[PDB]
Amino acid sequence: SDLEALRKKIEEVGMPEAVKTKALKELDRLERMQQGSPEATVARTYLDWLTEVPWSKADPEVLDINHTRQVLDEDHYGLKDVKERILEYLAVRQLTQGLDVRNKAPILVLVGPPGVGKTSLGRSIARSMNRKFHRISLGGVRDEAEIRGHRRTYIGAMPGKLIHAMKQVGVINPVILLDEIDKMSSDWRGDPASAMLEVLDPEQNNTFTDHYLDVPYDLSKVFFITTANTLQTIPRPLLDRMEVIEIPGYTNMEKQAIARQYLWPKQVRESGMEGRIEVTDAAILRVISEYTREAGVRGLERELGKIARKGAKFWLEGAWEGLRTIDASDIPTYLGIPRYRPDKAETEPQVGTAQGLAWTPVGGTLLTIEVAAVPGSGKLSLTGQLGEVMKESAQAALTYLRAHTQDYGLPEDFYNKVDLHVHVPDGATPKDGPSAGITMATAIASALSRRPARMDIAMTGEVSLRGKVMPIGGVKEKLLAAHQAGIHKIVLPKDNEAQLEELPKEVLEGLEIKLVEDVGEVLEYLLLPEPTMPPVV
Amino acid sequence: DHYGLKDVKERILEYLAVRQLTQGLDVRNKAPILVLVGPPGVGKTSLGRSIARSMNRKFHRISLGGVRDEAEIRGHRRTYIGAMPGKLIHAMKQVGVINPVILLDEIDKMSSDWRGDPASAMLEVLDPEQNNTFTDHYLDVPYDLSKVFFITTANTLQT
Numbered sequence A: 001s002d003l004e005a006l007r008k009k010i011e012e013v014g015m016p017e018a019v020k021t022k023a024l025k026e027l028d029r030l031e032r033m034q035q036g037s038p039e040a041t042v043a044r045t046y047l048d049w050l051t052e053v054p055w056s057k058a059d060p061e062v063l064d065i066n067h068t069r070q071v072l073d074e075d076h077y078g079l080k081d082v083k084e085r086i087l088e089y090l091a092v093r094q095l096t097q098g099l100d101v102r103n104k105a106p107i108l109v110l111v112g113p114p115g116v117g118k119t120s121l122g123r124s125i126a127r128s129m130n131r132k133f134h135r136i137s138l139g140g141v142r143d144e145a146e147i148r149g150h151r152r153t154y155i156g157a158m159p160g161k162l163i164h165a166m167k168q169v170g171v172i173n174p175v176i177l178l179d180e181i182d183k184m185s186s187d188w189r190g191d192p193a194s195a196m197l198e199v200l201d202p203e204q205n206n207t208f209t210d211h212y213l214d215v216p217y218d219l220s221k222v223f224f225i226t227t228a229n230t231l232q233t234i235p236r237p238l239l240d241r242m243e244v245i246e247i248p249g250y251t252n253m254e255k256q257a258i259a260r261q262y263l264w265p266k267q268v269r270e271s272g273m274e275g276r277i278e279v280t281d282a283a284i285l286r287v288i289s290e291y292t293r294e295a296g297v298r299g300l301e302r303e304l305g306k307i308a309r310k311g312a313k314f315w316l317e318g319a320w321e322g323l324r325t326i327d328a329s330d331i332p333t334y335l336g337i338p339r340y341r342p343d344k345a346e347t348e349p350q351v352g353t354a355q356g357l358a359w360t361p362v363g364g365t366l367l368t369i370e371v372a373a374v375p376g377s378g379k380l381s382l383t384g385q386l387g388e389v390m391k392e393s394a395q396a397a398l399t400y401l402r403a404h405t406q407d408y409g410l411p412e413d414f415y416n417k418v419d420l421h422v423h424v425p426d427g428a429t430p431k432d433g434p435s436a437g438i439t440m441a442t443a444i445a446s447a448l449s450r451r452p453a454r455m456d457i458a459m460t461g462e463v464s465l466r467g468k469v470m471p472i473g474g475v476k477e478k479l480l481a482a483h484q485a486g487i488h489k490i491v492l493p494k495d496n497e498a499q500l501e502e503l504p505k506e507v508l509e510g511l512e513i514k515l516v517e518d519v520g521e522v523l524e525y526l527l528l529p530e531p532t533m534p535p536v537v
Numbered sequence B: 001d002h003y004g005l006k007d008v009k010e011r012i013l014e015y016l017a018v019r020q021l022t023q024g025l026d027v028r029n030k031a032p033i034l035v036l037v038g039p040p041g042v043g044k045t046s047l048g049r050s051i052a053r054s055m056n057r058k059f060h061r062i063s064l065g066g067v068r069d070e071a072e073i074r075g076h077r078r079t080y081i082g083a084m085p086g087k088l089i090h091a092m093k094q095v096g097v098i099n100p101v102i103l104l105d106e107i108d109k110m111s112s113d114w115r116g117d118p119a120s121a122m123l124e125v126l127d128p129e130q131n132n133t134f135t136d137h138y139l140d141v142p143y144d145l146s147k148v149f150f151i152t153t154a155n156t157l158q159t
């Protein structure tokens, strides 16, 4: 009577008319499963979903931003303006919920380096709305292999892994998540972006065309959270209807915060030791700096585990009572020898030198431009694997000085008898871009005038010929690098006064950001008023 | 539809005249299909949907830039136990109007790799004496492509 039990469950689940006739034809067709079977064994994976797929299994959608906020921060730190845009996508649905919402609304998409929080939010955003998070690992699909299930052309007509999200969950109003959509390639037959349109259509996400599940499934509420790292490979006909929210990356303060309570324990327990060893907050800072050189945090936790594991072996090597503590005075005994020096400022004013700030995709760096003035013919040597653009900024600063030899008390004929030389340690890393011109403008001015330039001041500003300081890019990462180096005075163009707000409130208080517009402001600020070394001529 | 463009719309009012004023002849005789240009601030094909809507017709769209294979507009032979025809007839299917206007969707990045160049496919329907003489793999029968008023518009005119 099992061939009749298929009636019992198919007639009782659901059922919408859109999927009613889809069984009334095959409710009888598959009963020939004694011989073969071309069309009787290929229908057990037909009802076993239909007899098991949920219908109308609803859930109380959270209409309380405090239900979300008070638990989102319960899982993640910082990302304030980021979390500001997150809620900004949330309550747009609950303003027209039920009807006049599912018909048209943008799609949330998260982009950021793969170390920073990208998937945990999915479990965080879903649990905060009484649904079921699901991490469809799309990394591995770049072709027309499985974006919609096969036909009934074989016995292995297992549904599409996409619609299996509707199978794995037991409700009809889930939170379905994707991973790294830019891991595709739409350059051959069966464009893998075509189906995703219908899957993500803010108009027909209630019709899921397939090849074995011939009926386009009707899914009323399917909350979506899309993740990626590169906007480029993301399909074009999909990107154009996504209110994408970027995920920036961490700072050396929050990097100490997360690992203080999240990464360290969630790696200590799994390290056998369930509270029999603990690392001090000061010690983490070393591991924060001297071994962590990643934008995200995926690289960080691996070190702490390596501490725990190699720490665990010490127990079997020799026991110790209670919990053993680990401070910044014993870390190398666990992780080995450091791999990245810190970048600490120098304090004592030096001749013809300045503190340059450089942006890098993994943070910020404090570079030290240094120049020399030797009796020569007037050449200009720009050394240190400098980029072609920066070399232009060097003369740009130098030429400005040449027309103002009296105004800063420079040598009258330094264009002619003083052969400069600009170096930027280290010598192996390609340094590029016009922003550092304000600094160069300083050291060159100092080196000629023999008045030292104080180093407790950071500076960065692109220079123009007649002398106006122009805006730069990446003020956020640079300043953050400057503070963690221990600098408390910064010089910055007037234009970038706007983007000063992105810094945390604390660092902004720590720095006395001098805001300038012309170089004449800087050279009075930075140069010692007295001559300490003899000139060239 | 939009605001301004008094120097824009008429350049199609000076285009549709060749069809109404002369029907049967000079209405499908290899007419010059449109093209538009402007800064990258204005919504340009936003006028597109308001062309059929302006003439009461309907509208469909297939990404010709994404048209680079035979699972696209080209046909699927009837030998198989399952296969879908080209999106040309499918486009005709989703619509209920034999002349569905189609913007040249993203053809601005048109490649011409294997499985039929999307240009040769247009040659059949675009040619005024060939559109009535289509040919599928889904079928074999010369299928009369009456009209698909392509609205060509992009900011690339080289590849």
Ligand SMILES: *[B]([O])([O])[C]([C]C1=[C][C]=[C][C]=[C]1)[N]C(=O)[C]([C]C1=[C][C]=[C][C]=[C]1)[N]C(=O)C1=[C]N=[C][C]=N1
Residues within 6 Å of the ligand: A356, A357, A358, A359, A360, A365, A367, A368, A390, A424, A429, A430, A431, A432, A433, A434, A435, A436, A437, A472, A473
């Ligand atoms: B400026 O262009 O933003 C700056 C100039 C500079 C600063 C410090 C030392 C040397 C030069 N350069 C950079 O920030 C560049 C990145 C860049 C390049 C072009 C346009 C914008 C930004 N980064 C570096 O040169 C760099 C950073 N870290 C290590 C090595 N090089």
Ligand SMILES: Nc1ncnc2c1ncn2[C@@H]1O[C@H](COP(=O)(O)OP(=O)(O)O)[C@@H](O)[C@H]1O
Residues within 6 Å of the ligand: A075, A076, A077, A113, A114, A115, A116, A117, A118, A119, A120, A258, A262, A296, A297, A298
């Ligand atoms: N704001 C945050 N608070 C706590 N942990 C975080 C935060 N952001 C990221 N993480 C950690 O980063 C890790 C990311 O891992 P995973 O999700 O596998 O990679 P991806 O970042 O590519 O999604 C998680 O283990 C998570 O614990």
